[PDB]
Amino acid sequence: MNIFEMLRIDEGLRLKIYKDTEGYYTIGIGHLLTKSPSLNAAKSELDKAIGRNTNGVITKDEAEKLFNQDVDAAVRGILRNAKLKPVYDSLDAVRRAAFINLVFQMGETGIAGFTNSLRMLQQKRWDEAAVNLAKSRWYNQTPNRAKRVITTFRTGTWDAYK
Ligand SMILES: [Cl-]
Ligand SMILES: [Cl-]
């Protein structure tokens, strides 16, 4: 198991524009297109991201390409972020994948306040961090995915995902 397979389980793959859990226009492997309500604004962004007139549909290859870009940008953002970087550095390989998942999902941004959880993770207080992470809109909105991520942080293994 690796970050790609992990996120592919969490996000699924859809080749036609769809709405995500928050109601946003998405495509592929969790690739957010726009937060606007307009399906046309979504088709426009999609064509712009693909470099072709897509009519809201892409191929598996095109989906995989967006995915590779997005994981690369997720990692790079973490490494550029002064709050994130030290946590990431401190973690083992599995837990690093858990942190990447969290950022892919919610942006460098929204996780902005796992301030307390982040300090807990850096300190390696696994159980306490898992408890703190669970007190979040994140956990309440997408409880099954949150549980898997949380378990990866607690345990440092891929058990939640076999
Ligand atoms: Cl893009
Ligand atoms: Cl879920």
Side-chain angles (χ1 to χ4, degrees), residues 1-108 110-162:
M1 173 85 49
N2 52 64
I3 190 55
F4 289 93
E5 290 169 5
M6 182 200 212
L7 279 162
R8 161 97 179 55
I9 284 170
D10 284 336
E11 304 285 354
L13 167 69
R14 306 192 53 194
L15 301 181
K16 173 96 254 265
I17 297 182
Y18 66 98
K19 286 192 213 197
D20 75 5
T21 78
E22 303 284 342
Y24 305 129
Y25 283 128
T26 300
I27 199 156
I29 306 143
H31 182 80
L32 172 69
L33 290 165
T34 186
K35 291 186 190 168
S36 141
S38 184
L39 177 61
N40 286 307
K43 284 162 158 221
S44 186
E45 290 290 314
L46 177 64
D47 286 343
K48 169 162 66 83
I50 305 293
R52 82 188 172 63
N53 232 80
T54 63
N55 210 18
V57 175
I58 62 173
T59 72
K60 190 179 174 103
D61 290 329
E62 281 175 341
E64 280 162 354
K65 173 153 204 207
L66 295 180
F67 186 40
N68 280 320
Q69 294 172 173
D70 294 338
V71 173
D72 191 59
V75 175
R76 270 170 313 82
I78 285 169
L79 302 166
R80 271 197 270 99
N81 192 299
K83 273 94 152 315
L84 305 182
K85 182 185 198 286
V87 185
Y88 188 85
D89 283 353
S90 74
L91 305 164
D92 55 277
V94 186
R95 295 176 169 101
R96 290 188 175 168
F99 196 85
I100 301 176
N101 196 308
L102 189 57
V103 183
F104 180 101
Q105 189 187 347
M106 58 201 3
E108 209 176 309
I111 57 132
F114 283 46
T115 296
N116 309 322
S117 313
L118 297 172
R119 178 184 89 264
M120 299 160 203
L121 291 166
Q122 187 158 15
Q123 293 171 93
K124 305 196 173 308
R125 294 168 133 80
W126 319 124
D127 290 34
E128 320 166 41
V131 164
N132 184 273
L133 285 166
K135 299 171 171 145
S136 58
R137 175 178 195 277
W138 168 67
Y139 179 83
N140 290 106
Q141 301 305 127
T142 57
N144 295 320
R145 164 175 196 165
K147 279 167 206 144
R148 291 188 296 263
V149 172
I150 285 172
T151 288
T152 307
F153 277 127
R154 208 189 16 97
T155 73
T157 73
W158 293 110
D159 292 338
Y161 281 90
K162 297 187 319 209

